[PDB]
Design a binder for this molecule. Structure first.
Ligand SMILES: Nc1ncnc2c1ncn2[C@@H]1O[C@H](CO)C[C@H]1O
Ligand SMILES: Nc1ncnc2c1ncn2[C@@H]1O[C@H](CO)C[C@H]1O
Ligand SMILES: Nc1ncnc2c1ncn2[C@@H]1O[C@H](CO)C[C@H]1O
Ligand SMILES: Nc1ncnc2c1ncn2[C@@H]1O[C@H](CO)C[C@H]1O
Lengths: 153, 152, 153, 154
């Protein structure tokens, strides 16, 4: 099975972590994907020791190296800095890239993209919108990049 | 052959910041004998009247991070700029040298170890990461900090 | 019946609108408060005409003038600029102030408060944290400011 | 007697920004004959060794906004700074004169009319709001913009 790293800032808010993440994980898993979600995958880190921050950093770094694609939740103004670092790692490692934003605000300096142009550096010049999801219900669309990627095209 | 530093900042988005904040930093770096690639300057030959300009700038910045020796990332703001963060993650994944700059005294973090989100330090060592972390322009040329030591 | 203006950024994201806001609305309503939620209250605006943005701004401004207190959701780094404007209006108009933040990141310019000191300018020097709620489940606590407000204590 | 501008900005948080970005804006406003109240400077005499300093600064800033004639809000960033936004909201509710400054060319808005969150413009008129919206330091001096009309009763 293809491995998706689900990069989001939803683990920082108790309510967001509980209500927002599980539905996205389920949509992904219904496509046959193995989902790596960093907040859940790090729940067994000894939050006691002071080095936990460095341990989590390295664990997330390895999960990106070892995933097949990244599903980056890029809601908010601006998108979360941890998601962006992990997205930049994904781009540089030639992983598949999928972006999610159901926030309807536009926040960018260019007409082409709704966000800072670097978020799109790992996507094609034409047809990048096919990798850009704007609702949870769209994740399972057979006409979007995630489905096509699983099934060849 | 000079070492090449990609100077990643959000300062080009503001007319005033572009004019007054970047030159002092570029000059401090050039003083060390570094070749500075500053993405806003490096893309001023682009035709910003064509809609494809955004993709061309993305690919330029992507290529310049690939081709640099290290990144000097201005990570001021709450949060740090998302373009800088993508470029920083690229630099980490490609084993470039990493240097961080924050002269913002606000602390904005999940953890007690680091003043920012822990991912920004994933490419720095567990011990002694502070030596790569600059908190004022006047500190950039310090011979006790990681950028000078890396050059030599 | 006391009127709370529930100020939040959650109407900008489809998922956050449907999943995060109703639970907070219900917790406030269970205390016996009349909740004014600006995204719901503006859904009968004619959004085809360009001036809709001005109409929403004035309707929001009036709701804050006419409420008794503000319940400001100040998750995020930084908190939402619209919420902050409205918080600022509430402070100047001597409305009662209640803050909600279940995001565990600390992001502040000072040792005393968990956020930018100006968010607390309308709270008392002593006991400001009694107005600062950290989980949805805490909203109904008999020991916090909303309840004291409703029982005159 | 000079009109009083409260110059609200996040530039005091960064050593370089405080040193290089604020004085040119202060000078621009003073060139119009305005008295400028810049909160990072006005609070330099607070005793920052006592933990209550944050409460004293908050109250001092709150009082300055009550006592000013208008606010000049530097609303650069994505998003604009939350302390600036609180003070802007105070100024709107207190019927102060409102002037916004953004030389950030990123557009970051919920709507097609305004370049930023619509609530920042709630204190400005429906028509001609852009006359109060400055996009460069050099434009502060413009006799066609709101600061100058304000000072000449036009
Ligand atoms: N405290 C934390 N726990 C787990 N992942 C974290 C984290 N802080 C940052 N990250 C990583 O960066 C992203 C959110 O900032 C997603 C996650 O992989
Ligand atoms: N319009 C632009 N011009 C140049 N670089 C840009 C840019 N938008 C984003 N970037 C890249 O991403 C970072 C700033 O967000 C630094 C820069 O290299
Ligand atoms: N459509 C809208 N645009 C901006 N702000 C809005 C809004 N509807 C409601 N608001 C109020 O303004 C703040 C959101 O930015 C909090 C919210 O209560
Ligand atoms: N010394 C200081 N430290 C932090 N915030 C300060 C400050 N002086 C003033 N403030 C207020 O903090 C707010 C941050 O934008 C606005 C500003 O008026």
């Amino acid at each position: 099975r293809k491995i998706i790293f689900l990069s989001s800032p939803y683990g920082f808010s108790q309510q967001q972590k509980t209500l927002l993440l599980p539905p996205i994980v389920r949509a992904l898993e219904a496509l046959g994907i193995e989902v790596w979600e960093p907040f859940a995958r790090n729940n067994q880190i000894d939050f006691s020791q002071a080095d936990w921050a460095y341990r989590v950093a390295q664990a997330d770094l390895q999960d990106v190296k070892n995933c097949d694609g990244i599903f980056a939740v890029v809601n908010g103004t601006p998108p979360d800095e941890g998601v962006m670092v992990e997205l930049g790692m994904a781009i540089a490692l030639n992983k598949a890239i999928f972006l999610f934003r159901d926030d309807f605000r536009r926040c960018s300096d260019n007409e082409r993209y709704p966000l800072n142009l670097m978020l799109f550096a790992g996507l094609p010049e034409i047809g990048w919108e096919n990798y850009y999801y704007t609702s949870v219900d769209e994740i399972q669309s057979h006409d979007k990049a995630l489905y096509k990627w699983l099934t060849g095209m």
